[PDB]
Design a protein around this ligand. Structure first.
Ligand SMILES: [Cs+]
Ligand SMILES: [Cs+]
Ligand SMILES: [Cs+]
Ligand SMILES: [Cs+]
Length: 521
């Protein structure tokens, strides 16, 4: 349920003189978060609206920076942008009826190329985080500063007074700046620990308070896909001084990894008391060698061309992306579930299988009237597959296929129809299998493969005599025989399912096949 990125509009209560036009409180909520679609991290709908609204000059965007809020060494982010984007344009409607003071903008986080590949060991990510509060009348946090508002405005992190930003302080390699974030991730444990800090500018003679770093939060999360869900723990849960709105925790912490190898990550959370909404983004340090592995497979087989086109995935099998917009693969008002179930949702139309599979979905899709064949699924990584030492698995499932020369023929998944048996022998890693067509005696495709990592690779060939496109009508039965390279992966919790595909172009006969099966014996 977690998407590309999110943005919450920076709260500005209607601080008007009061013929009942004055807004008492401009609170925050989960419904005040708005979702961001595909594109570049440093640009989206509302931000473009800001750019249009901009005009003469002056756009404030939290990049880095290099003036406030950065960690040196964990410098440039290519896949992720998280922070604040606002404008100093106040809203005035003496033409009735509006009065808005403070930053007109959004607190967002956005990433591109969701990770289908993650490290297999402990990796630390450093970065930054930013917050914003609601707009309550006569609400001020002395610890944050009056310049931060919180009356009329909503206490923006970019305006927190007693923080270090300018880098002139300690001209050496002083690393952390402003509100920094630190994370340690154990991918083998599927666990994420974190801490949201606050770098203090130790006053010239250190006047009234305060030491180097104020621990604002900690973070506890777990993985399931390429995203992470969990809780944010406020360090000052015992607070009543009213010095800062970091009193309550947050059971609404969501996030995700970005980059092909998962070299970046970003997320958000909203405090339980609906007082503080916060975002964060972190990457690794500056011929790198982090041991990695694939966790998510998600591709379309173009129709026809040749190869496969990789498509974005969040680990949610129940829906897919077409590079543009979301496509739900669940039956609604049509009644679940049978085996296969096709759906159309405005932009395109598709058919998805099946019911016996929970960790993977595969089928066909259409828009250009040249159908492609998608396959997606969350793999079963990785030491679980490696440690497995059985003797014979015997997977069983089915497949979507298309063979043409011409003449052209296609086959769909069945519940005597299209079937697919697979024999997996661990310890030796050797796997064999066959997939058969509709009402036909002999196997259509024989697949021989072997297991590496959390996947399997091999070859699929037709019968010795070939595969007749027209078994009946003997003259030009079109015995098209095809030998191609088939690649697949193990999807599930205990590798209870498997999937894969193979395609083939030529300088005259073409083909494309996707398949999925379930472990039983
Ligand atoms: Cs404080
Ligand atoms: Cs204010
Ligand atoms: Cs200051
Ligand atoms: Cs709480």
């Amino acid at each position: 349920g977690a998407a590309y990125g999110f943005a919450v509009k920076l709260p500005r209560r209607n601080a008007h003189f009061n013929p009942k036009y004055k807004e008492k409180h401009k609170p925050l909520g989960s419904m005040d978060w708005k979702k961001l679609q595909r594109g570049e991290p440093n640009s989206f709908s509302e931000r473009d609206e800001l750019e249009k609204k901009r005009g003469s000059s002056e756009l404030i965007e939290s990049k880095w920076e290099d003036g406030q809020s950065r960690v040196v060494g964990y410098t440039n982010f290519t896949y992720v942008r998280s922070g604040y984007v606002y404008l100093n344009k106040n809203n005035i409607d003496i033409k009735n009826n509006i009065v808005l003071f403070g930053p007109d903008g959004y607190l967002y986080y956005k990433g591109k190329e969701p990770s289908k590949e993650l490290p297999s060991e402990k990796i630390t990510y450093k970065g930054t985080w930013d917050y914003v509060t609601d707009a309550m009348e006569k609400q001020r946090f002395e610890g944050l500063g009056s310049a931060a508002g919180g009356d009329k405005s909503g206490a923006l992190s970019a305006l927190e007074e007693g923080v270090l930003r300018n880098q002139a302080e300690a001209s050496s390699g002083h690393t952390d700046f402003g509100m920094t974030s630190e994370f340690e991730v154990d991918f083998s444990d599927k666990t994420i620990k974190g801490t949201l800090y606050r770098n203090n500018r130790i006053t010239q003679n250190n006047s009234e308070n305060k030491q180097i770093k104020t621990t604002r939060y900690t973070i506890q999360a777990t993985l399931h896909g390429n995203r992470f869900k969990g809780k944010a723990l406020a360090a000052d849960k015992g607070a009543t001084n009213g010095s800062h709105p970091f009193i309550s925790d947050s059971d609404s912490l969501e996030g995700g990894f970005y980059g092909p190898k998962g070299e970046e990550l970003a997320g958000k959370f909203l405090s339980n008391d609906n007082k503080v909404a916060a975002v964060f983004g972190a990457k690794q340090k500056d011929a790198a060698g982090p041991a990695t592995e694939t966790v998510i497979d998600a591709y379309r087989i173009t129709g026809e061309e040749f190869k496969k086109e990789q498509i974005d995935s969040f680990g949610d099998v129940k829906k897919l992306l077409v590079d543009g917009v979301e496509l739900s693969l669940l039956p609604s008002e049509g009644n679940k579930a049978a085996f296969q179930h096709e759906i159309e949702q405005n932009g395109v139309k598709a058919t998805v299988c099946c019911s016996n599979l929970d960790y993977m979905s595969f089928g066909k899709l259409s828009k250009e009237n040249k159908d492609d064949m998608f396959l997606q699924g969350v793999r079963t990584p990785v030491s679980d597959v490696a440690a497995r030492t059985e003797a014979n698995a015997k997977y069983r499932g089915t497949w979507y296929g298309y063979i043409a020369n011409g003449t052209s023929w296609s086959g769909e998944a069945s519940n005597g129809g299209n079937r697919a048996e697979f024999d997996v022998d661990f310890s030796t890693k050797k796997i064999s299998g066959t997939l058969t067509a509709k009402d036909r005696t002999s196997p259509a495709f024989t697949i021989t493969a072997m297991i590496k990592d959390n996947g399997f690779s091999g070859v699929a060939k037709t019968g010795e005599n070939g595969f007749a496109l027209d078994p009946q009508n003997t003259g030009n039965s079109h015995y098209t025989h095809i030998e191609a390279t088939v690649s697949g992966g193990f999807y599930g919790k205990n590798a209870i399912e498997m999937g894969g595909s193979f395609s083939f172009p030529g300088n005259q006969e073409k083909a494309s096949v996707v398949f999925g099966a379930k472990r039983q014996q």
